[PDB]
């Protein structure tokens, strides 16, 4: 069974736990390239009453650094906000809880904005069919495949 965070049948507790960044995408590709601030490797999501504690690691010169961030629920169901290199809001348009999680984020910094989409897996990689489903969701948001970066060959420290 699949659900969206914005949907009536969403069960937020079910996204608690281990996750790995499999693919990232953006309509501002530099944000997720090598030294981009949004090239984040998710490790776990801790579900709380009104927030999600996101644990990531970033990479610089082949060196991993831990980074934790707290996302608060906003006034719209299924939407979360978090301060990180600007003001961010995100939703989970599709997840099956047991294999994948697809997030759609809007960042706003210095009066600008960009979209980020992420595909996270319970294991360090996902099937090619789920990766294709993610590409389809990115296309629905006007993000070209050339702006989608598979990081499955580089998500471990």
Least distance from ligand IPZ to the Cβ atom of residue 36, Å: 9
- Indicate the residue among 94 and 155 with the shorter CB distance to Na ion: 94
* Cα distances (angstroms) measured from residue 73 to each of 22, 48, 130: 24, 10, 27
SS3 for 58-86 is EEECCEEEEEEEEEEECCCCCCEEEECCC
What does the alpha-carbon distance between residue 157 and residue 65 come to, in Å, rounded to a whole number?
A: 9
Residue 118, binding choice from ligand IPZ, Na ion, none, Cβ under 5 to 8 Å by partner class:
ligand IPZ
Q: State how far the Cα of 92 lies from the Cα of 59, in Å rounded to an integer.
A: 25
* 103 to 142: interface string for Na ion, x by CB under 5 A: -x--------------------------------------
Is 40 near ligand IPZ (CB under 6 A)?
yes
Contact 65, 57 (CB under 8 A): yes
Q: How far is the CB of 52 from ligand IPZ (least distance, A)?
A: 9
Residue 104: name its binding partner from Na ion, ligand IPZ, none (Cβ under 5 to 8 Å by kind): Na ion
Shortest spacing between CB 32 and Na ion, in angstroms: 17
Determine the Cα angle at 39 with ends 36 and 44, to 5°: 150
Q: Using CB under 5 A, list all residues that contact Na ion.
A: 91, 104
Q: Using CB under 6 A, list all residues that contact ligand IPZ.
A: 38, 40, 42, 54, 82, 84, 88, 90, 103, 105, 116, 118
């Amino acid at each position: 069974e699949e659900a969206s965070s914005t949907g009536r049948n969403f069960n937020v507790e079910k996204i608690n736990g281990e996750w790995h960044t499999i693919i990232l995408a953006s309509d501002k590709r530099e944000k997720i390239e090598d030294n981009g601030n949004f090239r984040l490797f998710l490790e776990q999501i801790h579900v709380l009453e009104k927030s999600l504690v996101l644990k990531f690691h970033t990479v610089r010169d082949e060196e991993c650094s831990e980074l934790s961030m707290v996302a608060d629920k906003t006034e719209k169901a299924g939407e979360y906000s978090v301060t990180y290199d600007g003001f961010n809001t995100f939703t989970i348009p599709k997840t099956d809880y047991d294999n994948f999680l697809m997030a759609h984020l809007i960042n706003e910094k210095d009066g600008e904005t960009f979209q980020l989409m992420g595909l996270y897996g319970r294991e360090p990689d996902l099937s090619s069919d789920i990766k294709e489903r993610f590409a389809q969701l990115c296309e629905e948001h006007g993000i070209l495949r050339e702006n989608i970066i598979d990081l499955s060959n580089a998500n471990r420290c």
